[PDB]
Design a protein around this ligand. Structure first.
Ligand SMILES: [K+]
Ligand SMILES: [K+]
Ligand SMILES: [K+]
Ligand SMILES: [Mg+2]
Ligand SMILES: [Mg+2]
Ligand SMILES: [Mg+2]
Ligand SMILES: [Mg+2]
Lengths: 377, 377
């Protein structure tokens, strides 16, 4: 049965992602000196201005302004006519610094309550939903061709959205593609459209999926010349859906960026991705979404729920059985199981936290053990 | 088949909700003078400090500092020992003001791309999921008993989470309840727990649902005395899931607060709630989630998807049929169909945007017409 589904992504240099990237840049910087730092670094950015504000508890000494400017310069906003200059914008910080003051550390309780969801599905090579994968892949391609001289008239800010038609569970093809890229005053729109079509759209979208019917809307309102923080406003924790799964799977509140791994909102979501991905790699189901919840000061999750949507290859209680035997889902367990106390986070902040294989939560190392506990199959 | 599901809510006075409420307070204030104002007002709040920052385009003259202080005073933070004083905190603003510069206005195109989701289900009186309804109802009850002198030792900030067990589609009862409330130094924990149990928990939770087994965790870490912005950080658009449906139904990125109705992220979500709620009130299904998407400069939604999860009482294409005949889903159509150009928004900003009947998107006025177009049934 036909039905269409859509997912959006934005690039590095879309304002809320600038803010995401700076928080995580500060997180890494601290983690490099003090892996057990507690950070919650929220960032706000607007036409003149980056305000990076937080509570931090750490040994580390880190330079917020230096870190802030470097990150805006990598993204590329480096001149007033772009909208924003990394070397002249204002950086304000308001980070309250605290300096650090049960028998098994693995039994320490959750830092806060929360619900968090992880998903996988055999739709893609990376076990992620196809729409959000392609939406991410279009925006990456844009920053790539921008940065490697190919189409050097394009500026940082860009949004993408791809809408997929499915018959029963099966991708059929791509109904509509939208891509809007900031560009210099040098190029104009007809020529721009050729260029994005040749160099961004056609090398990323599987041709089998694109038809005579694929409605492409490249720069629909025309001229996108000033962008980024100029005339707009970005805050960490806004591209929350993009980060995740483009709306295919669910979400509890929580933002990831600027939070160190004590923060279940981040870690438990990463671990839930890891359980679901290992479940589908083991061929226990085709699609799997799990919800995990916690309560403040309790170590055991208050709930685990696995939804294999009528796609299981073992009955479901037997699936929740091995979810528990193979995975330490306690806050400090998570941290152990995925070795998170490391500066790996700025990379997360742009094109999807998930589906990107070299991250600790993407490895399918528990695959077989799950399979051969699932009876043996 | 058993399975547990959880949803979280926070009160007015939880920091990200303070920020939500101030944005919407500014929105209303402008709407009162200029209904066609374009506002996108983002707010950040931290221990000393409220920064309210935006792009606005309007006739209206409005006092941001006055609006900011009044809203913090209604929430109740009015003395340094609470954590934050409305009459002494710093208000900074950075609102760029623009003064206002096709044949059928209903055909004007979408302001941005986006995906947005609406849900309903016959689980509750208000056609909303039971967990997020009760989670909201606990936090309301807290602010209510706080504000009406009953338990006047309690301070603004509070979080709630309720975890529900379901057998097949059917609520069975409440497995765990967590409630953590800020309180004065006057009361201590044993007495506090009685009070929340008597006056907040027991009058809100259906007794039939609570058992010998209901794990209640009231103030699990004990002493919550300073809260709100003190020592923490709130930004608009963070309690995005709470606003919605507690993680039962999906979400595209978008925050609601501080955005005027031109912003599809808000309006289309409100309209999608309205379609799904009218579909279930008409007895066309038991549960209905719809996704709507848009592209910048196009008026027709790029996709509509209806998921009645095997609960339909008419085949599904016939459901999407009447979704289109009964509802103008074009950006300016939405605005017409729900009469949004009015200062009704601050109320939205606290305890759920949905499930609250006196809002334009909650009325089931299209109920019958849907039913008797659905064949006649
Ligand atoms: K954060
Ligand atoms: K958010
Ligand atoms: K907003
Ligand atoms: Mg945004
Ligand atoms: Mg959180
Ligand atoms: Mg928060
Ligand atoms: Mg948006």
């Amino acid at each position: 049965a036909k039905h269409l589904f859509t997912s959006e992504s934005v690039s590095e240099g879309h304002p809320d992602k600038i803010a995401d990237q700076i928080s995580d840049a500060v997180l890494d910087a601290i983690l490099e000196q003090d892996p057990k730092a507690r950070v919650a670094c929220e960032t706000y950015v607007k036409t003149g201005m980056v305000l990076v504000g937080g509570e931090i508890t750490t040994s580390a000494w880190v330079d917020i302004e230096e870190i802030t400017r470097n990150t805006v310069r990598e993204i590329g906003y480096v001149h007033s006519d772009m909208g924003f200059d990394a070397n002249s914008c204002a950086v304000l910080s308001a980070i309250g610094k605290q300096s650090p003051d049960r028998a098994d550390p693995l039994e320490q309780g959750a830092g806060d309550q929360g619900l968090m969801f992880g998903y996988a599905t055999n739709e893609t090579d990376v076990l992620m939903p196809a729409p959000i994968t392609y939406a991410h892949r279009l925006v990456q391609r844009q920053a790539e061709v921008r940065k490697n001289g190919t189409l050097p008239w394009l500026r940082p800010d860009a949004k993408s959205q791809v809408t997929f038609q499915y018959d029963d569970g099966k991708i059929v093809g791509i109904d509509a593609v939208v891509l809007s890229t900031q560009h210099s005053e040098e190029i104009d729109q007809k020529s721009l459209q050729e260029a994005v079509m040749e160099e961004i759209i056609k090398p990323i979208l599987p041709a089998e999926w694109l038809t005579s019917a694929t409605k492409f809307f490249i720069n629909p309102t025309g001229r996108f010349v000033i962008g980024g923080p100029m005339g707009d406003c970005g805050l960490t924790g806004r591209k929350i859906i993009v980060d995740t799964y483009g709306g295919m799977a669910r979400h509890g509140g929580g933002a990831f960026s600027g939070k160190d791994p004590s923060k279940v909102d981040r870690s438990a979501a990463y671990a839930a991705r890891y359980v679901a991905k290992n479940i589908v790699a083991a061929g226990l189901a085709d699609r799997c979404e799990i919800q995990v919840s916690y309560a403040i000061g309790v170590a055991e999750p208050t709930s685990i729920m696995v939804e294999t949507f009528g796609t299981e290859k073992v009955p479901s209680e037997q699936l929740t059985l091995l979810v528990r035997e193979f995975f330490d889902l306690r806050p400090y367990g998570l941290i152990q199981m995925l070795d998170l106390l490391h500066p790996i986070y700025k990379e997360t902040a742009a094109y999807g936290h998930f589906g990107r294989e070299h991250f600790p939560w993407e490895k399918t190392d528990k695959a077989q053990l799950l399979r051969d506990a699932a009876g043996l199959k």
